[PDB]
Amino acid sequence: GTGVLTESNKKFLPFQQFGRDIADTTDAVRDPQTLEILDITPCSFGGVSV
Amino acid sequence: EVQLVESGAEVKKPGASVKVSCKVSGYTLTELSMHWVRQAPGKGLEWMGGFDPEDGETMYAQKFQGRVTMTEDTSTDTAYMELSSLRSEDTAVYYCATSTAVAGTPDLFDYYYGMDVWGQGTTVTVSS
Amino acid sequence: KIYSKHTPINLGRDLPQGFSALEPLVDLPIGINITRFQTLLALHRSYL
Ligand SMILES: *[C@@H]1O[C@H](CO)[C@@H](O)[C@H](O)[C@H]1NC(C)=O
After folding, report:
1. Chain B residues within 8 A of C45 when measuring between CB atoms
2. Glycosylation annotated at which residues (chain C)?
3. How far is B121 from chain C, CA to nearest CA, in Å?
4. Which of B12, B13, B39, B88 could cross-link B45 (Cys pair, CB 3.0–4.6 Å)?
């Protein structure tokens, strides 16, 4: 997936690895090597009007 | 509650080892301290020796040290004791006695010493 | 799959009200047929 990876304040339980939003889209991920929670946010975008 | 049964009475020429058995029931040997006692006719019954729950395992009398050796079989649940070099004064009846090793719950348990339950005796006879 | 939870319940009804969600503790790759079960108890010898 494409996005930015940020520090998250969401307290994951020890069994929980993946995270979902209200949309059930991949919102956070736990890296297997070092066990911190990386919040995934899609990269900057918008509509362009001329 | 333990029940103790005995071996057969025997007579033997002096100069050989004897084999006295004690078979237990209900409670295994590892839960029980085992002791052995000689009773001569016309005399009081005297302690040959037995188990020690702490500071050692199995220890013998001072007048019988180096003569009586004592084995325990958990697989057949039998306590054997043997002694060589028979004497004419050893014409006597041999008893096996047992007691619990400890007493109480596993959280709070106390050590136990004594001879509770007496089995039937085996008459050993040394003659010509 | 075994899920478990330990909850301190103030003296009263053993099955309390409210919600206590059981976290997934362990999954075991067993692959056997199971139709019956039994509970294991610990028993203490008397020595008295
Ligand atoms: C490698 O991954 C495991 C988790 O599977 C983790 O416990 C361990 O710390 C990782 N190794 C290092 C050097 O971080």
Report:
1. 27, 31
2. 33
3. 25
4. B39
